[PDB]
């Protein structure tokens, strides 16, 4: 276990556009025909989303390059993957992603999804080891490839899988598996909408909202991010001679939510059907100011949503000596 599955060299990541995708429900209360404004962590419109060819095929001799690098979780992660083969089947959320501090693990097998919060000694190259055990005639799935050991377990959540059982393609179609992860005030929030996509290359200019799915009480610090891939042995063919875990191809997308102010619109059925980013464009700021999508002809004064604090600076006097609070508090006679 914990073998080197990646090579010593990598490639620069591909950059593509988020064509207005990734809005989620920020409240569980039904709202009908309400242009309600809400401030929360939202993915900016027309932003760079990092394309990650985890397994990229190129010609014949250059069979495949494997790369699933650890990423900073930051404010939150917008995860979209459009692979019919069900190669992507889990994620690992954490800090050290080591046994020093606890970490989250969502593994989505066919039978059930398992969410465990333990101190996981993860492998350097985490993946799910699908294999065939001759004894029960079962292609069985091995988790030991994800982490070496699990200890001090604090959570366990078993429920229905949420990937539509990896079926329903019906030929010449693909499913966009979108996910949004947020860690606020000790709660983990996952939002997910899965839709049939026609263009297999990039994101739809189409608009969809991400339904609330689960709100696990994980209670852990989450500064780093990585995904779990499903790989099969390269001894698949008789006479083939490779022990590597080579399989399929993965083309997931990772986007980072940033704090923004949005004017979500709720349709009669209660479904968000359109949304406006206040900072995206001067017109969108006019729509935010008027609180209406239709803006009449003329001149309008608009309030500020465009600029955000990039960093923080603190300026204190040059002070070296500590205060004698130990002198005052620990005095023998008062």
């Amino acid at each position: 276990q914990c073998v080197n599955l990646t090579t010593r060299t990598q490639l620069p990541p591909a950059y593509t556009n988020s064509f207005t995708r990734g809005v989620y429900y920020p409240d569980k209360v039904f709202r009908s025909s309400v242009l309600h404004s809400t401030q929360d962590l939202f993915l900016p419109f027309f932003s760079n989303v990092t394309w990650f060819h985890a397994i990229h095929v190129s010609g014949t001799n250059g069979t495949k390059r494997f790369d699933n690098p650890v990423l900073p979780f930051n404010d939150g992660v917008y995860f979209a993957s459009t692979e019919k083969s069900n190669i992507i089947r889990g994620w690992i959320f954490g800090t050290t992603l080591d046994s020093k501090t606890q970490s989250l693990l969502i593994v989505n097998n066919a039978t059930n999804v398992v969410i465990k919060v333990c101190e996981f000694q993860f492998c350097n190259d985490p993946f799910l080891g699908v294999y065939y055990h001759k004894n029960n005639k079962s292609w069985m799935e091995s988790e030991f490839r994800v982490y070496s050991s699990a200890n001090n377990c604090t959570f366990e959540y078993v429920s229905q899988p949420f990937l539509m059982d990896l079926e329903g393609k019906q030929g010449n179609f693909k499913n966009l598996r979108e996910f949004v992860f947020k860690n606020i005030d000790g709660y983990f929030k996952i939002y997910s909408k899965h839709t049939p996509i026609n263009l297999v290359r990039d994101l739809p200019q189409g608009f969809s909202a991400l339904e609330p799915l689960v709100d696990l009480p994980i209670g852990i610090n989450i500064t780093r991010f990585q995904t779990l891939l499903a790989l099969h042995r390269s001894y698949l063919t008789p006479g083939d001679s490779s022990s590597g875990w080579t399989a399929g191809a993965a083309a997931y997308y990772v986007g980072y939510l940033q704090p923004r102010t949005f004017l979500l619109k709720y349709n009669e059925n209660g479904t968000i059907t359109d949304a406006v980013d206040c900072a995206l464009d001067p017109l969108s700021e006019t729509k935010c100011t008027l609180k209406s999508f239709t803006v009449e002809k003329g001149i309008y004064q608009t309030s500020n949503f465009r600029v955000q604090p990039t960093e923080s600076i603190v300026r204190f006097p040059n002070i070296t000596n500590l205060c004698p609070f130990g002198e005052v508090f620990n005095a023998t006679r008062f």
Partner: antibody
Amino acid sequence: QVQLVQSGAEVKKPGASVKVSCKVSGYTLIELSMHWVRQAPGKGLEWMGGFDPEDAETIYAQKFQGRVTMTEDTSTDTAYMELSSLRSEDTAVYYCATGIAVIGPPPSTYYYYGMDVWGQGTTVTVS
Amino acid sequence: QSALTQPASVSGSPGQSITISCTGTSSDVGGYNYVSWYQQHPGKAPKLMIYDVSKRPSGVSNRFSGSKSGNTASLTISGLQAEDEADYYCSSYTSSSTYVFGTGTKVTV
């Protein structure tokens, strides 16, 4: 990649029992179907000892039954064999063969009828 | 338990085509199309050249091919060189769940 290691030669006496090992590396025995071989000079090979991928069993030819048995240790990835009642007839070399359980991707359960990977073998001899 | 018939006395010139034949009973060879040949150099581990009658694995040259029709199975050797003089076997799965072999064939350049 997939390397099979053997236990070396064991010279014996007629009537005794021979114990042989076969160690895998780079790939696990739970994922490998294994066949045994009784290579001898001057005569072709015969199939005595195999784990059927199709049948979750380990059967042998009618000529060689009861005289030989198969015990498998999956913890140390070592494959074993007990022979019994060998009286001056075991002059042969024992190759440890193995092949794929089921060829194809994980959805595919198609069977494999092969003995693809071999070891260096063990040259047992009974005097 | 039985054995497959192989003509043990074969030879030929380099760069010439030789067909090596394997013939067996319906009980064994007749039951399936899974007969696979080998390439064992003396005192060496055997290699697999063709599987399931013709499908040849990666790492073998175009010079080795095979076909089985009716009952008798054949291994065809073309473009012969001096390193291919070896002892060859045919191996077929039977209805008794056994992979019986043949007497073997010795080719000499």
